[PDB]
Ligand code: HEM
Ligand SMILES: COc1cc(/C=C/C(=O)O)ccc1O
Ligand SMILES: COc1cc(/C=C/C(=O)O)ccc1O
Ligand SMILES: [C-]#N
């Protein structure tokens with residue numbers, strides 16, 4: 206029963222405080238809008254959007270931050286702390302960490318040039334973190350299209366539009382050499398690069414990510430507009446210039462009969478992509494929320510009250 210008006214009486218400036226925090230951080234860290242969107246996705250795919258990802262380690266449960274999809278990868282946690290502190294100062298004990306992160310993701314998208322919309326609100330915060338579930342549920346860059354579809358369905362997103370539109374988050378941000386080395390030098394034990402990678406881009410990427418090189422070096426997900434939220438991600442796919450395997454599979458998989466037309470539709474029209482992104486974002490944001498009196502409004506996003 207979420208609603209976009211949930212804080213219109215109790216904390217009417219929450220989205221403004223969130224926005225100003227991100228505007229400021231972007232001057233020194235141009236990557237932070239992308240990092241924050243990713244945090245929200247990794248929240249919603251593990252027991253729902255319940256801020257379980259923000260919890261640090263305790264002696265009775267491990268943090269999701271040591272999951273394969275989060276360790277030495279997920280980032281931005283201090284920025285979420287700063288905006289939470291600012292909102293707590295303005296509207297004490299009102300806005301859940303789960304909702305804060307949902308607003309932060311939306312405002313990140315708008316600030317980077319994407320659509321503007323009011324997210325549904327009224328989620329509450331978990332009482333535990335789920336490390337094993339994060340290892341089970343977050344999809345990996347080496348997944349096939351059937352594995353990606355199974356990963357989305359497992360959490361409740363059955364639609365191929367959900368998968369294709371939400372993969373558009375890779376219109377900005379960075380990726381480590383580590384996750385493309387197989388594609389550049391030895392794909393699926395063939396001793397060859399992935400044939401679905403454009404051979405001119407292949408040269409470029411080998412230059413950035415040499416064999417025996419720094420596996421933690423960073424590369425841009427979108428070679429056209431690395432920091433702008435736009436539909437250029439889909440244009441790249443159509444040219445075999447998706448960066449990671451899971452990107453290019455949306456256009457090139459044997460199982461892509463349903464996803465190819467969505468990829469083209471989104472490359473062809475900014476409005477069609479933005480409308481679908483908003484619709485899929487709100488469906489992801491509605492995965493198994495705690496509401497009403499279930500869970501908490503956490504005061505410090507890293508610890509249960
Ligand atoms: C469909 C399956 C997906 C997989 C396999 C995947 C995989 C990845 C991987 C491997 C990275 C780079 C991590 C690093 O190098 O440490 C990345 C980054 C990122 N992903 Fe995804 N992702 C997927 C879906 C999504 C979705 C649904 C969104 C959001 C709507 C998202 C938003 C992003 C962003 C914005 C970044 C850049 C983060 C920054 O630069 O800090 N991804 N993803
Ligand atoms: C209390 O802090 C803030 C309040 C606002 C209000 C904005 C508006 O009413 O448009 C904006 C930024 C802030 O940091
Ligand atoms: C770093 O990004 C990710 C890595 C994995 C999995 C890695 C593995 O199984 O080794 C899954 C999701 C991610 O977002
Ligand atoms: C994306 N993780």
Ligand SMILES: [Ca+2]
Nearest residue numbers: 248251253257
């Ligand atoms: Ca969660």
Ligand SMILES: [Ca+2]
Nearest residue numbers: 376427430433
């Ligand atoms: Ca872009």
